[PDB]
């Protein structure tokens, strides 16, 4: 009740919160624990991430700071959480640091993603790795350093630094070797990262894979893509 309050004020009226307003619970922040006390969390990132851009203050040694409690923070959570600190650090990235975690990291597990099909399931951990590849790419641009990424040609072979149509791709045969709610799982967030640029979202390859699904009338499927 006291943070439904809190929210509120977050998301409009923003520009009213002092550096002790965060600076205070920011080492409070960490706290994090593993059972239904966890999922006040997802009250807490969220107006975290509602007052950071223009009510930043922070200070340029604790921005440097800042991520390292997070990227210890992001290892087993509830699929809800995961919603909001992407669109957080990945906001946050430009912030502080380069285009190199949001690039080393997503390039190793872009191959431990390929260690994922081509592994065991883990349909409970895979998911892990085959929402938050787009969950990166959906609110955070790719249209970077991607040299290393083409010198990752060798399975994303066709065109360009457009690595969506052909994550698209990686993806789009991806739907019919699968079986269940492993199709859905990767039916949502094909259509995530392609939210981003819609210009894809006319093109041939994933309308046919709209056409394809559409005749399968499958309630589960034809449900999450509305």
Same mark, same amino acid.
């Given at each position: ?9 977050s998301?409009a009226?923003?520009?009213l919160?002092d550096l #002790?307003?965060?600076?205070? $619970?920011?080492? *409070?922040? +960490?706290?994090a ?8 969390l997802?009250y ?6 509602q007052?950071?851009?223009f009510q930043?203050?922070?200070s340029?040694?604790f921005?440097r ?5 997070l990227?210890q923070?992001?290892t ?11 669109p957080?650090?990945? #906001?946050?990235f430009t912030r $502080?640091?380069? *285009?190199? +975690?949001?690039?080393k ?8 993603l390929?260690?994922?099909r081509?592994?065991e399931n883990n349909?409970q951990?895979?998911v892990?790795?085959?929402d938050l590849?787009g969950?990166f ?6 249209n970077?350093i991607?040299?290393d990424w ?5 399975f994303?072979?066709?065109?360009c630094?457009?690595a969506y149509?052909?994550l698209l791709? *990686?993806?789009?045969?991806l739907?019919?070797?699968a ?10 967030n ?6 981003r640029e819609t210009?894809?979202?006319?093109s ?7 056409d ?10 034809v449900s999450?893509?509305?």
């Amino acid at each position: 009740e006291i943070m439904s309050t809190l929210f509120v004020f977050s998301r409009a009226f923003p520009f009213l919160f002092d550096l #002790s307003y965060l600076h205070l $619970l920011k080492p *409070y922040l +960490r706290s994090a624990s593993t059972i239904e006390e966890q999922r006040f969390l997802y009250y807490v990132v969220a107006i975290f991430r509602q007052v950071l851009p223009f009510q930043k203050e922070i200070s340029e040694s604790f921005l440097r700071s800042l991520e390292s409690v997070l990227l210890q923070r992001l290892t087993k959570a509830g699929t809800a959480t995961l919603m909001e600190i992407v669109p957080c650090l990945c #906001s946050l990235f430009t912030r $502080l640091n380069d *285009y190199e +975690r949001l690039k080393k990291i997503v390039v190793s597990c872009l191959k431990s993603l390929e260690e994922a099909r081509h592994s065991e399931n883990n349909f409970q951990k895979m998911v892990r790795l085959i929402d938050l590849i787009g969950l990166f790419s959906r609110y955070g641009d790719l249209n970077r350093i991607n040299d290393d990424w083409k010198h990752s040609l060798d399975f994303i072979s066709p065109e360009c630094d457009d690595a969506y149509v052909i994550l698209l791709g *990686y993806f789009q045969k991806l739907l019919k070797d699968a079986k269940g709610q492993l199709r859905i799982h990767i039916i949502d967030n094909m259509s995530r990262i392609c939210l981003r640029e819609t210009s894809l979202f006319i093109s041939p390859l994933m309308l046919s894979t709209l056409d394809m699904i559409i005749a399968e009338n499958n309630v589960n499927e034809v449900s999450v893509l509305f």
